[PDB]
Amino acid sequence: MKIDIHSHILPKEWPDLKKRFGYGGWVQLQHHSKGEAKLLKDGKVFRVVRENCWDPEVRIREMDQKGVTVQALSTVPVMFSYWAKPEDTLNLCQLLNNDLASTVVSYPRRFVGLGTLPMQAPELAVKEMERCVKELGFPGVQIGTHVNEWDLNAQELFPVYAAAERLKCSLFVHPWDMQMDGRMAKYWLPWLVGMPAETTIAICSMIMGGVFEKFPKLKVCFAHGGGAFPFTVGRISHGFSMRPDLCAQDNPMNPKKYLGSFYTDALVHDPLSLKLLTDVIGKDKVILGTDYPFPLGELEPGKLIESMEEFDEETKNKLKAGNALAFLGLER
Amino acid sequence: MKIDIHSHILPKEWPDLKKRFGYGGWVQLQHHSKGEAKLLKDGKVFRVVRENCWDPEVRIREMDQKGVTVQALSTVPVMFSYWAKPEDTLNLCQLLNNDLASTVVSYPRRFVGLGTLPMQAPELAVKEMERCVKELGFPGVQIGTHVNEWDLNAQELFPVYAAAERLKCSLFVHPWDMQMDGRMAKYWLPWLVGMPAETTIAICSMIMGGVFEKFPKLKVCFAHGGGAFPFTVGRISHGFSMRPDLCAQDNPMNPKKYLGSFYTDALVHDPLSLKLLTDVIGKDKVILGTDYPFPLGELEPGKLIESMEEFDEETKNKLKAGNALAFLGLER
Ligand SMILES: O=C(O)c1cccc(C(=O)O)n1
Ligand SMILES: O=C(O)c1cccc(C(=O)O)n1
Ligand SMILES: [Zn+2]
Ligand SMILES: [Zn+2]
16 A cells, blocks of 8 residues: 555557568557557457556556555566567667656656566666666666576576666566466466466575575566475575585575575565565565556455554554665665 | 375386387386386386385384384386387386285284276276275275376276275375476476376366265365465465466366365375465364375374374374374274
8 A cells, every 4th residue: 555566657658660670479568448458469369458557547546546656666577578679679679768767757756667677688788777777767676587588596697687786776576487287278377376386486486596695686586475485495505405416506505594685575465475475575565566456466455554563663564665666776 | 003095116127118118118126236216218217216115014014113003105206108100108106006905914013005007098097996895905006197199188088987986995196297398307306396286286176176066975086285285275266266268167166165185195205294284174184194105204203293282192192093094094
C-alpha cells in the first residue's frame, strides 16, 4: 500500500518494428475495440491488455484507489528482444526507455523508471545504462533471467555488473522466455512453474558464478519471491557441500551465505509463503511487488502484507516501502 | 530413526540388456574396488556407487548404526526405461522386482519393496502391478514424474490408477529425466533445480488432471517435499482462479483444495522448509525419507525431524514411522 517494485507498462503505440529493422519476430500493439489492445507476436494475439497498461492517468487512478504511492515502471518482458541484432535491440531500448522517461517526468512523485538494455551486446548495454542513469535518471534497469544461452553467470555479462555497481544502478531480474512447448504447453505451467524455476536458475547462476562476490555492491532484486529458492535453498546449499566439483567451481562460498545479499519481491500470494520468504531472506530484503496490471499478480496491493498478524509496524512498513527505498537508492 | 520411504537399490549384477534386447543405450553395473562400482549409460559412467547400494547386509549395519528400522526399497530412477520397447522394459521390470522380492525375504522386518513398472504401456504395467501386490507382497510402486511426453494426467494412464486403487497399491512418484544439456549443464542444476521442478510439474498435472478426483482412494507420495509445490502453491492456486480457460478444463476444483490429499517425503534439508511443509501438506501427510545411499540425501536419517523444536515427540513419530505405515497400509 506504498511502493510497488514490480509493474509493467507499454507505450500507447510504437512503429512497425518489422518495417523498421527488416526482419520479423517483433511485437506490435493492436488497438481494435475500445478499452482493449492486442499484443501480436507475428501472427498470433498472444495476450490481451487493458488501458491501464499504457495510460498513466488510468494508472494513477487505480493507484489512488489501492493506496499505492509509487509504481516502478518497467516494460513487459516480451519486449526484451534479447535475440535480435544488438543495434536493433538497442534502438528499441532507447525508444522504450524514452517513453518510460516521459511517463516519469510527468508524475515524478508517482513513478520511477527501470530501463531495459540490449543484454546480448554487453558493450551496447553498458552505454544505455549510463544514458539511463545520467540522462534519464533511472534508479535501475530490469533484466531477463537469461540472455539466450547465457545465464547470469557468463563472464561476458561481467562488464554490465561492473557498470551497474559503479553507476549505483539496481537490478530487477525478471523470469522470461520460459519453455512454452510440449509438456509445458498445458495447464499454464510455463507461468505457474516454468517462471519460478527460471528465477531459481538465475539466483543459482549468480551466487555460484561469483557475481555477488565479484561485485559486493551490485544491488539485485528477483521477481516472484525468488521462485522456488526460499524453500529449496536447503537442498541447493547441501548439494553444494556434497559436490564442490560440480558446484564450487567458480565461487567457493556456500549459497547460504549470500542470504541477505539480495532482495526479492513479495509476490507469493500465501501468508505462509511470505513468512518463510522474510524468515529466509530477511525482513529487510523483501519488497512489495504486484505484477500490475497482470492477473497472475496481487489484485489488492499490500493486502497480504497488512494481514500478517506476525509482523509489527516497522516490519510491514519496511516490506511496503523502506526496502524498496533502500534497494533503489532513493529516499522518502 | 524409524521408517525410510526413500531408498534406492540395485542387483549386484544384471545381464546384458543391449545384447539381450537388440539395442544399446541401456544401463549396467561395473565393479573395480572389492566394494565400489560405476553405472554405464552405454559407454561412459555418470554415477560412482559404494557397496551400500547393492548389498543388503551392508545396508542393515548402517541402518542399525543410524537407528533406521525399515527401508522401503526402489530401483534407481535411471532404471525406469520408459523409452524402450514395452516388452524390453516389462522384462527388465520383472528382473528388478524379483531381485527386490529376494531381498525382502532375506530381511522381512527391515525391508519392503516398491516395484517398478513398464509405464509406457498401461496394460502391461497394469499386470506387473497385479503381480507385485498378489505374488511378491509389495505394498506399492515407484514411478517417474513423467512418461515420455505422457504426464501423470494423460488418460492413457487412467487404467494404471484404477488398478492401483483396487490392489490398494501406493504410488511413490520420483523425479527423473530432467534436462541435461543446454543451460542446465552446470552447477548440478538438473538435480538442484530440474528435479524439484519435475515433481512440482507432476503434482500439478495430477491435480488439474482430476486424477485425485476420479480416484479418491489413490495413495500417492512425492519425492523431496513435493519440490517447489509447498512454497508456490499459492501462485498455482491463484493462477487457476484467474485463468480457468488454461487451467480448469479437465478438473474444476482449485488445487488448494487438495492440500491433504497426497503425501510427500520430508527430504527438504532445512527446518524452515520442513515446518512450512507440515503446515501446507499436513502433519499426517509428511513421511521421513533419506534417498539413501546417495550424497544429496540426509546423511543423518531422521535428524532434522528430531531437532524440530516445534514438534511434540508424538508429531515427530508420525513423521518417522507413523505416516509411512498409513501410506503403505502396514502394521506397526
Ligand atoms: O509478460 C509476461 O509473461 C509476464 C511478466 C510478469 C508477470 C506476468 C504474470 O504473472 O501475469 N506475466
Ligand atoms: O537416480 C537418480 O537420478 C536419482 C534419484 C534420486 C535422487 C538422486 C540424487 O538426488 O542423488 N538421483
Ligand atoms: Zn512481472
Ligand atoms: Zn531418490
